[PDB]
Design an enzyme around this catalytic site. Structure first.
Site, short mmCIF file in Angstrom:
data_model
loop_
_atom_site.label_atom_id
_atom_site.label_comp_id
_atom_site.label_asym_id
_atom_site.label_seq_id
_atom_site.Cartn_x
_atom_site.Cartn_y
_atom_site.Cartn_z
CG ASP A 335 -67.60 135.60 85.78
OD1 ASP A 335 -67.25 134.40 85.86
OD2 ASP A 335 -68.63 136.04 86.31
CE1 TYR A 466 -69.74 130.83 90.41
CE2 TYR A 466 -70.40 129.57 88.48
CZ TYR A 466 -70.28 130.78 89.14
OH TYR A 466 -70.70 131.92 88.50
CG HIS A 524 -70.72 140.46 86.43
ND1 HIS A 524 -69.57 140.12 87.10
CD2 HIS A 524 -70.99 139.43 85.59
CE1 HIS A 524 -69.16 138.93 86.70
NE2 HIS A 524 -70.01 138.49 85.78
#
Ligand code: FVS
Ligand code: FVS
Ligand code: MG
Ligand code: MG
Lengths: 548, 548
Positions: A335, A466, A524
């Site tokens: 990730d 982010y 994921h």
């Protein structure tokens, strides 16, 4: 009715082929008189050299000559000559490395321990001071993690079938005689057990032994499905702490010896996301440094957004190596860890022995277009706009920590979120359950560990990863001239719907020697979804590309 | 008048022989036209391949073919043919591993940094993605510890002699132009420095360069005595934590990669007693785990005496290995650590790769006589009777922690205690100074670290090591049949008057392959008394006996 403890012999029960088998085979090979070697081994009985060895009176290397003494005069009683090239060290060395864990017995013991049994190893063995004793030492390490006790004859000064050692066993298990099964490949070691009232099992072939065990315990041991890899109990782990900067300390878990393998977890996770691969990789010959990435767990989580842009993040990982005294480590990421890992390779390849990413493709920056524009184009990344405004995403994700992880950590066929229109509805959980069902991937206990961890610094640290799109764009653009020519792996997950495999399709352009991996029915959260096949892939690639 | 900062070029200043030297030599070897290779390197100027490389636009492996392009058409302009077996990768590989730290320059920089200078490395260098880039990576690791900044061209996107990078340097040093010396082996890199008002030094031979530096700084740099090994600043160290038992956690400092080397300190000390050998041994190719032994520092110090008998102590070290995932480590010990180390070998040799002790001889138990009787026989051990009654020895040693260590940590020709009649006078310090002078072995700061550490758990934990004589006697007696046949070293200290070298004189009886070491003018506190020659001895023995 009712057992509570299981005791396993080592040679010929938990480890095969037995070393008595390398007595008989060597004889047949060398056309020696039937026995001879076995007669030399047992020579002297209770007061013989081998009994002294097994009680830790003398070491294995002290015993070799004493054993050769016995093979000199056993052969002289039959007037036989030993062969030109006889070396009882060489015979016993081969037998010992040839001996390997009997996997179906080891599973059987785990199973019983999973169901409330007190398991223990009871073995006649020796103080191994040979040049190659590290072989057996590892075998013993792997075994003992999985048992409450490891009782060796040479450590306690007592030997099977002496009744006293059985009394020691009982005392050590804190259990009455009829509450314990004892499995062994020798009749003589079972009689003393039976006399105290123990259930015994004569182990010949492994399958028939399990049937007996199965029958007397009343728990499925034979034929049960392939069990999960070994997981990590946090309090048994070695925890490491390095400050890389005034108020930034990185925390990591360490296990194994060998080349450094640095595991970088994703969002919103921790070192504990690698629980299934830490032991595996240790076992494969590697020194695992499983990280709490900056912003997570016992690593620092400083408020500033800028502190979580890739460049400073990467530099800190360099400083982490510097202070640990490592010239390289092989960085493996998932990730967000994946993204970062790729950038370590592009900006610090002298420090990266090799590189690997689960799910996260390497995509180069688009030098014309700003990334905040690109992410609005593709609705699957709509959750990342939501993560932009400081404070909002935190309030929700922290509102209920349990709900949050239970909701996130799910397999691909257990989805409980609507992926797009996240700004539209204003929340990741808007129309999601308050008390979601517990996913098949994670027990109640594993979730609460994550809960525990995020109670320290919450989601400000994590979300900030982010919040440096523009800054990371500008940085990555410096690498647009470069390529990746160090060993590199890309593991794709079929059913990761946000990090789709197609995203990785052009990666060999900038990484021509890229090796690949793929996992069917994998969401994921690769590591806990398919831990068995992840380790298989990574170990293979480590052994082939990351060493020799 | 007055400098405050020193900037050192890398190639041809801090590291020799320079890589430009392997241009010229290869040409002469191959009888190539004077220049050719150097002409290919510099081909294109500011916009050439080599300038792109130095700015981190492309990697070294991307540059190899571009450099060969330049060597193809430089040789075609003179109509020359390249040799059958030409490989510009092979030439540059050799040059790079041949390059080694210029030790007298590195000392000169340390010296200047010791005296308040801000030191930094300013170098044109590259993103090294070759198969053998780990070589240079280590070289860079060793160097950068000793400098406040390492400014590489390929990391900052700027290159010498561009004025901008000098402005970066100034900005990074937070210092005005006339407060900084810049040393470099190229005229062109000094001109831009001079223009801002910097002092420069054209480095040809190293000695003449230092004279200049010496003259302009006004500090002795050439000919100064051999400086101490690199020490450890505790806050830069990686700290490790393993719980081996319900309320027992062991703390250790970790540095290096390679075979595990476990350092066990003595009484009354800490991991920090190995400050001089941690970096050295890391550097020698080893993974140092420097321990806070149970009872000391950030390791647990449970009150019970029994918790500090050798057997439980040793078992815990085994568990320490177990949980760290280590099948072996080479255990090196001093004083009490020494004793324990020897016992690890005798009781757990499958876990000990090799064994080594400073000062502490292996003496076997006397099976007839109890040791509390033997220790009254020899008056030099009179201090150990004093240590028997719980509480008494604590009150004194804790009364004044500073006084205590200052008093203990002294060289053999700085003694400030009377050794015998300690019960007689009732105290270790009875007729010793309240404020002793500071020993030449330890700065004020190093003492206060020890002070800091003992403020946690005091001396109950440490002293208890002396309070299991009878129990350790009984234990050791089990080993009286055994011998030590794994690699083993014994380092004796001439002027350790309590652990006299003669005590070790019969040790080859039980350890026939024992190797030895001896140090003249060496007290009890071996590591800080003679750190240079300790490392020399241990590294040699590690490389010869503990690996290959
Ligand atoms: C490839 C790209 C242009 C370049 C962008 C770029 C370049 C450099 C950089 O440092 C960042 C980015 C943003 C990236 C964003 C792409 C990152 C892909 C995701 C990898 C980072 C972590 C995925 S993580 O949020 C998944 C977690 C899901 C989840 F946890 F369940 C959550 F709860 F939904 F959050 C680049 C753009 C994407 C589309 C565009 O074509
Ligand atoms: C060899 C011996 C018989 C066996 C004894 C033995 C056996 C097994 C065992 O576990 C312990 C002992 C005690 C030993 C004690 C000998 C240990 C020699 C010292 C090594 C342990 C640590 C030395 S440490 O106290 C020095 C610190 C000095 C100092 F710090 F400055 C201090 F401040 F003065 F304390 C054995 C006897 C000594 C004499 C007799 O002949
Ligand atoms: Mg057996
Ligand atoms: Mg130079």
């Amino acid at each position: 009715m009712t057992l509570r403890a299981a005791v396993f012999d080592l040679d010929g029960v938990l480890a095969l082929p037995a070393v008595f088998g390398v007595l008989g085979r060597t004889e047949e090979a060398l056309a020696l008189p039937r026995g001879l070697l076995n007669d030399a081994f047992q020579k002297g009985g209770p007061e013989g050299a081998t009994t002294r060895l097994m009680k830790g009176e003398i070491t294995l290397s002290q015993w070799i000559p004493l054993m050769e003494e016995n093979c000199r005069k056993c052969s002289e009683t039959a007037k036989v000559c030993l062969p030109k090239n006889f070396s009882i060290k060489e015979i016993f060395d081969k037998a010992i490395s040839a001996r390997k864990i009997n996997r179906p017995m080891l599973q059987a013991a785990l199973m019983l321990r999973k169901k409330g049994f007190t398991t223990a190893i009871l073995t006649n063995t020796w103080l191994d001071d040979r040049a190659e004793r590290d072989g057996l030492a590892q075998l013993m390490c792997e075994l003992k993690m999985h048992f409450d006790f490891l009782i060796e004859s040479c450590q306690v000064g007592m030997v099977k079938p002496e009744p006293q050692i059985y009394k020691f066993l009982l005392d050590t298990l804190k259990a009455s005689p009829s509450e314990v099964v004892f499995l062994d490949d020798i009749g003589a070691n079972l009689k003393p057990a039976r006399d105290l009232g123990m259930v015994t099992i004569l182990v010949q072939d492994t399958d028939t032994a399990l049937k007996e065990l199965e029958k007397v315990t009343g728990i499925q041991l034979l034929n049960t499905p392939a069990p999960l890899p070994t997981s990590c109990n946090p309090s048994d782990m070695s925890h490491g702490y390095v400050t890389v900067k005034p108020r930034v300390r990185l925390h990591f878990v360490e296990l194994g010896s060998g080349p450094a393998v640095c595991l970088c977890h994703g969002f919103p996770e921790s070192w504990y996301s690698w629980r299934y691969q830490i032991p595996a990789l240790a076992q494969a010959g590697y020194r695992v440094l499983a990280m709490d990435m900056k912003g997570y767990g016992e690593s620092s989580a400083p408020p500033e957004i800028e502190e979580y842009c890739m460049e400073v993040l990467c530099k800190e990982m360099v400083t982490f190596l510097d202070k640990l005294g490592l010239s390289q480590a092989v960085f493996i990421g998932h990730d967000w860890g994946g993204m970062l890992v790729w950038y370590m390779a592009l900006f610090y390849p002298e420090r990266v022995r090799a590189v690997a990413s689960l799910n996260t493709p390497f995509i180069p920056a688009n030098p014309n277009m700003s990334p905040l524009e690109s992410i609005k184009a593709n609705p699957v990344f709509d959750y990342q706009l939501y993560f932009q405004e400081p404070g909002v995403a935190e309030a929700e994700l922290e509102q209920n920590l349990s709900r949050t992880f239970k909701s996130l950590f799910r397999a691909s066929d257990e989805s409980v979120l609507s992926m797009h229109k996240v700004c539209e509805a204003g929340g990741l959980f808007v129309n999601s359950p308050e008390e979601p069902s517990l996913s098949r991937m994670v027990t109640e206990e594993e979730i609460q560990f994550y809960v525990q961890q995020f109670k320290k610094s919450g989601f400000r640290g994590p979300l900030n990863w982010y919040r440096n799109m523009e800054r990371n764009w500008k940085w990555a653009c410096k690498s647009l001239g470069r390529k990746i020519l160090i060993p590199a792996l890309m593991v794709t997950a079929e059913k990761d719907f946000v990090l789709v495999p197609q995203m990785s399709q052009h990666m060999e352009d900038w990484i021509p020697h890229l090796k690949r991996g793929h996992i069917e029915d994998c969401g994921h959260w690769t590591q806990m979804d398919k831990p068995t096949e992840v380790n298989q892939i990574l170990i293979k690639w480590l052994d082939s590309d990351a060493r020799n």
